[PDB]
Amino acid sequence: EVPGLLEEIKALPLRLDEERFRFWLQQDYPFVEALYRYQVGLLLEAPQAHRAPLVQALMATVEELDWLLLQGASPSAPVHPVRAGYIALLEEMGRLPYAYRVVFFYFLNGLFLEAWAHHVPEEGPWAELSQHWFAPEFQAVLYDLEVLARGLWEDLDPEVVRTYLRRILEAEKATWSLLL
Amino acid sequence: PGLLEEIKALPLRLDEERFRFWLQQDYPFVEALYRYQVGLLLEAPQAHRAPLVQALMATVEELDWLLLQGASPSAPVHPVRAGYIALLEEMGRLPYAYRVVFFYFLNGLFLEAWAHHVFQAVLYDLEVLARGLWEDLDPEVVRTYLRRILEAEKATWSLLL
């Protein structure tokens, strides 16, 4: 956390609408599939001691793709350039060393939860929705991921973490602004 | 095509200590099955994922277990196992359809021989998947590999002779 970008996304003058939001969720399929790919790449390098949490996270991503399918999504469909650039970001981070990727995967999730909790109302039908998009053990797994990233963090160029963290926040700001 | 039968017999020395040892040096193989399984997820369609990630999870757990009662992650691999790990790695270079079928066959096989000489819902899901893909694959390619697999499993249990 360095610094201001997060508060930006939050400050967004968004107008949450059921149908309008539902569409926004369905248009995230290409990105969730990319996340799944990225996650599989972690399991390919993941040491034994790290596997348990990563396999649980994959499980959640998979179920999420099922939920989007049953919710109208279509794997084969034009991807908004904003989401396409975000998808390339993941693949790009897929190139980085294992340790970097796991810290970034942790960051990504933490950021997803943060942005959602702020903009998505808790009250009515939104509660139901939110309690479908996030797996029950999302935050349980997240904690296990934090513990991993917290150790992996140790020795890795903090300036490299910044350039990428900043771009991830930017890609997030772009995908949320599509709700303006 | 009858190779299973040969495995079934094997007047194996069912000693405990000899078995605990035989189990301990199975980590490399199981670690190989792990990589083999991650390779399945890297090509598996959204409809096959659920049962696959479930099996992967089982393998991970199986590894932690092997770690409990000994088993050295870093340890010279018995040539027979080494050869089997080589089989998997080769089968890993095959099309996805053949790999899921072969993966299903492998587990049903392990369970087979283990029940004779010595989760099940996941095996059920693998059954459905594999069986549905068994349709189109070339019977010749599945013939040679299935045979290799049986020979590999025969060689490994024969270490208990």
Contact B67 A59 (CB under 8 A): no
> Which of A40, A48, A59 shows the shortest C-beta gap to B42?
A40
Cross-chain residue pair B53–A59, CB shorter than 8 Å = yes
What lies within 8 Å, CB to CB, of B35 at 6+ separation is A44, B92
CA nearest A36: which of B51, B36, B42?
B42
Using CA atoms, how far apart are residues A85 and B38, in angstroms rounded to an integer? 26
Counting Cα atoms < 13 Å in the Cβ hemisphere of A31 gives 21
Q: Tell me the chain A residues in contact with residue B64 when contact means C-beta distances shorter than 8 Å.
A: 48, 52
Residues A77, B45: Cα–Cα separation, whole Å? 16
Give the Cα separation of A150 and A140 in Å (integer): 16
- DSSP category for residue B69: T
When computed from its CA atoms, the radius of gyration of chain A, rounded to whole angstroms, is: 16
The residue with tokens 């249990």 is: B157
Contact A26, A71 (CB under 8 A): yes
Question: Measuring CA to CA, which residue among A95, A79, A84, A107 is closest to residue A168?
Answer: A107
Residue A48 has its nearest CB partner, among B41, B56, B63, at B63
For residue A91, how many other CB atoms are within 10 A of its CB?
12
Do B46 and A62 make contact, defined as CB atoms within 8 angstroms?
A: yes
For residue A25, what are the domain limits?
1-180
* CATH number of the domain enclosing A126: 1.20.910.10
Domains contained in chain A, number: 1
Distance CA A116, CA A94 (A): 25
Phi, psi at A14, each rounded to 5°: -80, 150
Residue from the list B53, B61, B67 with its beta carbon closest to the beta carbon of A58? B53
B57 touches chain A (CB under 8 A): yes
Q: How many residues comprise chain A?
A: 180
